[PDB]
């Protein structure tokens, strides 16, 4: 039954700032709690075992506290390398359950999405397929919603989404959304739109095109 609740799932912070991640165990696990750090691309690495003990070779700014049911990892004075994903894990006996994980992300200023919409290329059309692509680029924060419409009604399925990790240079996010249809479905309807609901506007941004253009 052992459940490990790690919050927040998403944390914004600057370099030098002092952040705190928490882990709640559903039952008493004493000091049997470890913290790992997983950089983008790599295997995880042990930071802390026994709730408060730093593994050899781990910098001292990292600092685990807590016991029984309530646990925290603190990182004093952040550094560029300290950004990533962070997991708790129970390690007494079975199951050695992980918390859901926290993505430590570099804050910046809010930015609206740049939305571009793209009809199916003529090349795809000769294959017998049709994909409409919408890019939503360089927005912050990472939370966003996209809705597709064909004529005057939503389309749920056929939509594949993909997201970039946070940018090296400008610390933003971007998102691709592709709606796929048969050529006959695509040709049977005129208008195609892509609505972007972001915190940077009460109103959603709408980009569209008429097939007959």
């Amino acid at each position: 039954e052992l459940q490990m609740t790690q919050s927040p799932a998403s944390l914004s912070a600057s370099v030098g700032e002092t952040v705190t991640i928490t882990c709640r165990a559903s039952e008493n696990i004493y000091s049997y709690l470890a913290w790992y750090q997983q950089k983008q691309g790599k295997s995880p690495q042990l930071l802390v075992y026994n709730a408060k003990t730093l593994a050899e070779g781990v910098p001292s700014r990292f600092s685990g506290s807590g016991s029984g049911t309530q646990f925290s990892l603190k990182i004093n004075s952040l550094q560029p390398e300290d950004f990533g994903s962070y997991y708790c894990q129970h390690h007494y006996g079975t199951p050695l359950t992980f918390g859901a994980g926290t993505k430590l992300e570099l804050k910046r200023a809010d930015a609206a999405p740049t939305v571009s919409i793209f009809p199916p290329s003529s090349e795809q059309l000769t294959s017998g397929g049709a994909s409409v692509v919408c890019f939503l680029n360089n927005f912050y924060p990472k939370d966003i919603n996209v809705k597709w419409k064909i004529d005057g009604s939503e389309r749920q399925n056929g939509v594949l989404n993909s997201w970039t990790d946070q940018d090296s240079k400008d610390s933003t996010y971007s998102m691709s959304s592709t709606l796929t249809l048969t050529k006959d479905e695509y040709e049977r309807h005129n208008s195609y739109t892509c609505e972007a609901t972001h915190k940077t506007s009460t109103s959603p941004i709408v980009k569209s095109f008429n097939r007959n253009e």
Binding site: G99, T114, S116, T178, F209
Partner: protein, 216 residues
């Protein structure tokens, strides 16, 4: 150090055995855990084997799906996964467990990627994304229907690197689909050329698609 085997492409209903060479220590001294991570998602404990006695404990959710063994002679632990489905597509790690002192998993391996698909090696279709109906214009390429990963995308043979976003591939109905956009000044394209370069090493394929304005 712990070294795992390479990436794997397996059909639905088949099985895979992945290996994990333990070294730098006495294997029969320490347990060996296995951990599952779907791409872009959390970690999940599978179980452990104790090489000394071959003793197993499993996350109940993986009992029957995962089978741990260990050949003490070759210092190597295995995990066999059986009757594979889409859900089993993940990266899998072996991880050494701690000692009497205070338990706890310490040394991870590099991981082993497992992909479940019925597809054979397939080259990508590359479709240009030109604007239909401003100081900056966004263009792009849709790279569709390939297998396996990875493909690489550049623009103008690398010399266009600012304003480029190449998105992670998504696997639907056995094949991958990826996209890439590039934003340039409306004063340049289409008077200056913009071309995407898409390489797919597994099929020995390279494709240049010049982006041309839509006809009308």
């Amino acid at each position: 150090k712990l070294l795992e085997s390479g990436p794997e492409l397996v059909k639905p209903g088949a099985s895979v055995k992945m290996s994990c060479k333990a070294s730098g220590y006495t294997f029969t001294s320490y347990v060996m855990h296995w951990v599952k991570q779907k791409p872009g998602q959390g970690l999940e404990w599978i179980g452990y084997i104790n090489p000394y006695n071959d003793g197993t404990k499993y996350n109940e959710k993986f009992k029957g799906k995962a089978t741990l063994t260990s050949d003490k002679s070759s210092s190597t632990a295995y995990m066999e996964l059986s009757s594979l489905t889409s859900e089993d597509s993940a990266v899998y790690y072996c991880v050494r467990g701690g000692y009497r002192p205070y338990y706890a998993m310490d040394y991870w391996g590099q991981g082993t990627s497992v992909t479940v698909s019925s597809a054979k090696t397939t080259p990508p279709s590359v479709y240009p994304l030109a604007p239909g109906s401003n100081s900056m214009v966004t263009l792009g390429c849709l790279v569709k229907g390939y297998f396996p990963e990875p493909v690489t995308v550049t623009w103008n043979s690398g010399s266009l690197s600012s304003g480029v976003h190449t998105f992670p591939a998504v696997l639907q109905s056995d094949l991958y689909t990826l996209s890439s956009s590039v934003t340039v000044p409306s004063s340049t394209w289409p008077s200056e050329t913009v071309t995407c370069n898409v390489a797919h090493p597994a099929s020995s394929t390279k494709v240049d698609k010049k982006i041309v304005p839509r006809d009308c």
